[PDB]
Design a protein around this motif. Structure first.
Motif, PDB file in Angstrom:
ATOM      1  N   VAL A  87       7.461  -7.209  75.172  1.00  0.00           N
ATOM      2  CA  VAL A  87       7.507  -8.643  74.893  1.00  0.00           C
ATOM      3  C   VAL A  87       8.945  -9.009  74.538  1.00  0.00           C
ATOM      4  O   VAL A  87       9.664  -8.206  73.927  1.00  0.00           O
ATOM      5  CB  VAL A  87       6.553  -9.050  73.751  1.00  0.00           C
ATOM      6  N   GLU A 138      15.158 -13.115  90.885  1.00  0.00           N
ATOM      7  CA  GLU A 138      16.356 -12.984  90.065  1.00  0.00           C
ATOM      8  C   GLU A 138      17.564 -13.531  90.819  1.00  0.00           C
ATOM      9  O   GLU A 138      17.707 -13.305  92.025  1.00  0.00           O
ATOM     10  CB  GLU A 138      16.592 -11.517  89.683  1.00  0.00           C
ATOM     11  N   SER A 153      17.407  -6.807  86.770  1.00  0.00           N
ATOM     12  CA  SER A 153      18.515  -6.721  85.829  1.00  0.00           C
ATOM     13  C   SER A 153      18.283  -7.647  84.634  1.00  0.00           C
ATOM     14  O   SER A 153      17.234  -8.279  84.514  1.00  0.00           O
ATOM     15  CB  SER A 153      19.839  -7.050  86.516  1.00  0.00           C
ATOM     16  N   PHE A 175      19.115  -7.679  80.167  1.00  0.00           N
ATOM     17  CA  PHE A 175      18.870  -6.760  79.064  1.00  0.00           C
ATOM     18  C   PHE A 175      18.643  -7.554  77.790  1.00  0.00           C
ATOM     19  O   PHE A 175      19.474  -8.387  77.419  1.00  0.00           O
ATOM     20  CB  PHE A 175      20.034  -5.782  78.883  1.00  0.00           C
ATOM     21  N   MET A 204      13.718  -5.932  73.241  1.00  0.00           N
ATOM     22  CA  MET A 204      12.352  -5.936  73.743  1.00  0.00           C
ATOM     23  C   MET A 204      11.450  -5.169  72.790  1.00  0.00           C
ATOM     24  O   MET A 204      11.792  -4.062  72.361  1.00  0.00           O
ATOM     25  CB  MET A 204      12.307  -5.320  75.143  1.00  0.00           C
ATOM     26  N   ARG A 262      13.890   3.147  79.027  1.00  0.00           N
ATOM     27  CA  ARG A 262      12.588   2.498  79.154  1.00  0.00           C
ATOM     28  C   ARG A 262      12.718   1.113  79.772  1.00  0.00           C
ATOM     29  O   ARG A 262      11.984   0.763  80.702  1.00  0.00           O
ATOM     30  CB  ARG A 262      11.920   2.392  77.785  1.00  0.00           C
ATOM     31  N   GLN A 263      13.647   0.303  79.255  1.00  0.00           N
ATOM     32  CA  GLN A 263      13.793  -1.062  79.746  1.00  0.00           C
ATOM     33  C   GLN A 263      14.437  -1.104  81.125  1.00  0.00           C
ATOM     34  O   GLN A 263      14.078  -1.953  81.949  1.00  0.00           O
ATOM     35  CB  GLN A 263      14.605  -1.897  78.755  1.00  0.00           C
ATOM     36  N   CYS A 264      15.383  -0.202  81.397  1.00  0.00           N
ATOM     37  CA  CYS A 264      16.067  -0.208  82.684  1.00  0.00           C
ATOM     38  C   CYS A 264      15.269   0.482  83.785  1.00  0.00           C
ATOM     39  O   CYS A 264      15.575   0.286  84.965  1.00  0.00           O
ATOM     40  CB  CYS A 264      17.446   0.444  82.552  1.00  0.00           C
ATOM     41  N   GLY A 275      11.605   0.528  83.542  1.00  0.00           N
ATOM     42  CA  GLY A 275      10.308  -0.118  83.612  1.00  0.00           C
ATOM     43  C   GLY A 275       9.139   0.730  83.168  1.00  0.00           C
ATOM     44  O   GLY A 275       8.044   0.592  83.717  1.00  0.00           O
ATOM     45  N   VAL A 276       9.336   1.604  82.179  1.00  0.00           N
ATOM     46  CA  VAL A 276       8.232   2.403  81.654  1.00  0.00           C
ATOM     47  C   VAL A 276       7.173   1.477  81.080  1.00  0.00           C
ATOM     48  O   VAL A 276       7.476   0.571  80.291  1.00  0.00           O
ATOM     49  CB  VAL A 276       8.743   3.397  80.598  1.00  0.00           C
ATOM     50  N   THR A 277       5.923   1.694  81.482  1.00  0.00           N
ATOM     51  CA  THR A 277       4.790   0.911  81.010  1.00  0.00           C
ATOM     52  C   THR A 277       3.876   1.765  80.142  1.00  0.00           C
ATOM     53  O   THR A 277       4.099   2.966  79.960  1.00  0.00           O
ATOM     54  CB  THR A 277       3.980   0.314  82.172  1.00  0.00           C
ATOM     55  N   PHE A 278       2.820   1.121  79.637  1.00  0.00           N
ATOM     56  CA  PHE A 278       1.872   1.760  78.728  1.00  0.00           C
ATOM     57  C   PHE A 278       0.432   1.451  79.124  1.00  0.00           C
ATOM     58  O   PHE A 278       0.116   0.322  79.499  1.00  0.00           O
ATOM     59  CB  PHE A 278       2.131   1.317  77.284  1.00  0.00           C
TER      60      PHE A 278
END
Ligand SMILES: CC(C)(C)NC(=O)N[C@H](C(=O)N1C[C@H]2[C@@H]([C@H]1C(=O)N[C@H](C=O)C[C@@H]1CCNC1=O)C2(C)C)C(C)(C)C
Ligand SMILES: CC(C)(C)NC(=O)N[C@H](C(=O)N1C[C@H]2[C@@H]([C@H]1C(=O)N[C@H](C=O)C[C@@H]1CCNC1=O)C2(C)C)C(C)(C)C
Lengths: 305, 305
Positions: free
Chosen positions: A125, A166, B1, B3, B6, B298-300, B302-305
């Protein structure tokens, strides 16, 4: 005390995220009651996206061509139609986790939370603001389209954004939930130019109130100003004009602190003309404009949902 | 892209938040299986909190004295005990929304998301870092205690923080889920002093990698440095020492960009000694240290859960 960029609780929206696969393209969809909403470029190959004819691409697709997965469960598609830049996929199952919701088209300067998602699963989020040039400074990768932006009011999730593409300089553009893009954008891979962005003045002023509420008051001067004089100075620094509607919306913060809006405008005029001289406000060396007046009251008063 | 700061998706933790009321005090509790965890100063009046004897205050309380509400539903308390600075309230109902979870005690420099809550209801998510002086820069008001900090790994919510109190300069301090405070703090209202904070160097370096990944590369110089030389320069600017363990953890980011850690250390040495000359990195005029190397990947990626 303390003040941070705060996002809405994402639970109600996590229960709605699904995966939509058509051919070799996969992105996220939003499952509300018995309909899945997703961007229409899922029916594209990478060669189609340079100049797609979505109406023609869609008529060659059947219901079975859309693979929709809620977690490990496939939702059988029993119907589809195109509305502007989104597809509405009708499924044989209503989402039991559907929250009370509405589809809203927000205004520039207003804020919302984005639930970044990949393959129907949430990644994080963060809070965003609809810039005056109708873009958002987000964080999106390949496969994040279909992720939505939203606000929560008590029990009601207002969905306001779905991600599509984007633009140069990490700039993102999307539609409302009726498929209409925010700003002068189309969903094709060809040169398009966003407008000049500007600073959301009412939000800077609301963030200066959050600073006073937290005890960061060094920037307050002994002066007042007229609304016309302030808007003349603000114009040179690419700040949007301040309207009497903006002054009225700042009323709750002004009354709580006992600082008239125009007095706070006088202090902001000094900060713009003189700079910050290496000092910081609420830990920031730059003035912040992605906190609405509502967000400041919500965070400083503890409004829950 | 793009940043951005998060936070984790908060859904799994929203299903665990409850309201705990004892006498005239109300704060939040964490409902996992058939136990509610909450800070022990719920059994205090405001006169007790100046110098409380929690063991003596608790022995004069019965199970019926704890009013626990999950939404509009009261959970009957059938047992209670004190563990360090938290109370464990046993209830006759197991939380059907209990996620896969573990209780973790995190290290300084590591990050986690806080779900700010009031009266058992969530107010927002934001990401925090456990400072070297064992505090967190959060956003908490009266009634937010019991809110938790957490990380998510796939399906597993690691609970790492529960909020207890605020220190001078909007600084917050709490315990792990076993009731042990982070840092040299006690839960009483008397003068206590936090240690000197310092900048989390491995996190600054990881955030400079996020900048390169996003195309913000103006700060890269043609130099390298030794690890001893860098740590000598960093010391003057209140940066924590960089260890070989830190270099190894930066490995994935270094390999992805092809920039050796020590080369990036050379560029950071120049930024610290020369300043930023009014330029910004990833939109920030100050160097950021609340992104771990893991958060950047993780953010760059795209690791999800
Ligand atoms: C020239 C101009 C200014 C128009 N830009 C432009 O062509 N941009 C492209 C773009 O975003 N596209 C192209 C294609 C869809 C959209 C796309 O891939 N969307 C992703 C959803 O899954 C999300 C993206 C992936 C990276 N980060 C994101 O946010 C469309 C039908 C438009 C691209 C070159 C960045 C790939
Ligand atoms: C002197 C020093 C440095 C020790 N500070 C100190 O006394 N602080 C106090 C404090 O935080 N306390 C006092 C009392 C509990 C804790 C309390 O009220 N906790 C809240 C939970 O509901 C959350 C708080 C409310 C505001 N923001 C928050 O984060 C305790 C048993 C310790 C106070 C003066 C700020 C009220």
């Amino acid at each position: 005390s303390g003040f941070r960029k705060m996002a809405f609780p994402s639970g109600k929206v996590e229960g709605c995220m699904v995966q939509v696969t058509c051919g070799t393209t996969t992105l996220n969809g939003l499952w509300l009651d018995d309909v899945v909403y997703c961007p229409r470029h899922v029916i594209c190959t990478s060669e189609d996206m340079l100049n797609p004819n979505y109406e023609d691409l869609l008529i060659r697709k059947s219901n079975h061509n859309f693979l929709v997965q809620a977690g490990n469960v496939q939702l059988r598609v029993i119907g589809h139609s195109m509305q502007n830049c989104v597809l509405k996929l009708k499924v044989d199952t209503a989402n039991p986790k559907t929250p009370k919701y509405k589809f809203v088209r927000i205004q520039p300067g207003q804020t919302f939370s984005v639930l970044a998602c990949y393959n129907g699963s949430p990644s994080g989020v963060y809070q965003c603001a609809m810039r005056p040039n109708f873009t958002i400074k987000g964080s999106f990768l390949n496969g994040s389209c279909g992720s939505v932006g939203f606000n929560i009011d008590y029990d009601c999730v207002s969905f306001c954004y779905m991600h599509h593409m984007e633009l140069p300089t990490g700039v993102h553009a999307g539609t409302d939930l009726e498929g209409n893009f925010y700003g002068p954008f189309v969903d094709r891979q060809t040169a398009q130019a966003a407008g000049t962005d500007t600073t959301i003045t009412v939000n800077v002023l609301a963030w200066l109130y959050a600073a006073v509420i937290n005890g960061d008051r060094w920037f307050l001067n002994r002066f007042t100003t007229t609304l016309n004089d302030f808007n003349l100075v603000a114009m040179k620094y690419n700040y949007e004009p301040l309207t009497q509607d903006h002054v009225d919306i700042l009323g709750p913060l002004s009354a709580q602190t006992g600082i008239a809006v125009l007095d706070m405008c006088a202090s902001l005029k000094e900060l713009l003309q003189n700079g910050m001289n290496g000092r910081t406000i609420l830990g920031s060396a730059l003035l912040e404009d992605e906190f609405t007046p509502f967000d400041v009251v919500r965070q400083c008063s503890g409004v829950t949902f």
